[PDB]
């Protein structure tokens with residue numbers, strides 16, 4: 250009879266964790282929190298709490314992490330939960346594809362992220378960074394959809410899940426926007442050797458699309474720059490990222506962005522440039538990135 | 543006849559109406575100042591430019607910002623007003639268009655009352671509908687082509703009739719619903735710190751379209767605002783700071799304040815992008831300094 254409250258991050262790893270713990274009748278409550286709120290001590294944690302994918306708290310019932318049951322060679326916290334409770338000894342065979350999807354450190358194929366299907370599609374359309382929620386108010390909120398998906402994934406297949414009204418509404422918008430985003434990219438993307446530059450600053454609309462589309466469409470580039478309007482078109486934002494499909498870029502992006510008052514880490518960064526300087530800085534970025542290879 | 547090169551804003555629309563009404567133009571091209579400045583726009587002697595940086599080869603250049611083809615009045619509140627006065631005012635143009643002209647003269651100076659920017663009507667509504675910074679743009683027709691239907695219609699229909707055109711009415715309905723949700727989230731997510739309102743939108747799933755003066759109209763006791771928002775793909779945090787158009791008393795030089803954090807702007811508006819791990823420190827530092835400035 251005794252059940253626990255899941256405390257986790259609002260992401261695909263957290264959804265899958267909740268699906269697994271709910272399926273074995275182990276949780277009856279869930280609470281999505283920000284990692285730094287956990288680190289700062291704003292989330293009260295009791296011995297009736299299960300924590301996944303968050304920093305360790307001593308008085309919790311169980312803590313699953315992957316960066317107290319920890320496997321740092323597991324690609325996700327869900328995988329730790331999976332293997333800890335038996336895997337397919339405990340869970341339906343159909344969920345191996347769920348586990349495959351949650352485990353993707355970004356080990357996707359280019360094909361997988363173009364016109365995505367199954368669990369990958371569910372993952373991308375729920376991810377805040379895909380931007381579905383920026384671009385539309387749906388029938389119900391993404392928070393309330395995540396909540397409802399937990400129990401429905403316990404007794405429905407992925408193809409049925411994708412047919413649910415509140416999901417299929419998001420699927421249709423995701424499909425429409427992806428098509429328009431890809432034609433936008435074909436109109437606005439310019440290749441410079443190893444770098445694809447996507448100049449959006451002359452487009453009326455930007456479209457939602459998952460964050461791997463641009464890399465999948467230029468498999469010969471190992472780095473991208475998005476050139477975009479900043480807030481209320483007051484300045485120009487350059488966002489630079491390395492390709493998950495060609496990981497060979499020698500640019501340290503964080504250090505490069507630093508020269509222009511921005512930041513980031515080795516594989517991703519941004520900077521913000523005044524309008525009268527943006528052409529000069531674009532040429533300089535391109536020159537430097539081409540020199541790096 | 544000539545080609546008009548202008549911005550896709552209300553000023554540009556009114557300029558096209560005036561020049562079309564005296565049979566001076568038969569094509570139009572919408573561009574942003576940065577493309578003119580960067581030399582990306584082919585300008586020829588068949589072109590009339592309004593409300594854009596001067597480019598040398600044009601037939602005429604109408605400007606109101608602080609040689610013989612350059613018709614500049616740095617004290618005019620819009621380039622449409624320069625056009626209006628250059629071609630003779632109410633002799634040349636219907637005297638009934640003075641209302642349209644009154645509305646277009648409010649834009650760059652943002653000389654609005656609080657009640658004009660909330661639940662807007664008439665020409666003010668059209669202005670905010672067409673302002674890219676309102677954020678409205680998946681409609682039947684692009685904002686480009688709507689601007690074209692609007693140029694013709696403004697030459698012969700009334701503002702009330704125009705707001706009932708199907709392609710306009712569909713934008714109006716969206717604007718009204720988004721403004722309702724915007725005002726709700728601005729009032730629930732804003733926190734006043736003496737002269738400043740800080741609008742923390744980082745936990746909203748959706749940021750709704752609204753004209754850029756609503757926030758100041760909901761916090762009339764504040765002379766300055768900060769929007770705290772997610773940057774690109776939630777990779778960092780954006781702070782966008784702006785002075786109020788209703789209480790113009792803020793003593794902060796915003797552009798110089800943002801410069802310390804790798805951003806910039808001018809005295810009255812600016813932004814910066816901050817690492818997630820630095821956002822709490824920079825938020826408090828911005829508030830402290832703005833509060834010390836008054």
Ligand SMILES: [Mn+2]
Nearest residue numbers: 262302325326
């Ligand atoms: Mn993790």
Ligand SMILES: [Mn+2]
Nearest residue numbers: 593620621650
């Ligand atoms: Mn102007």
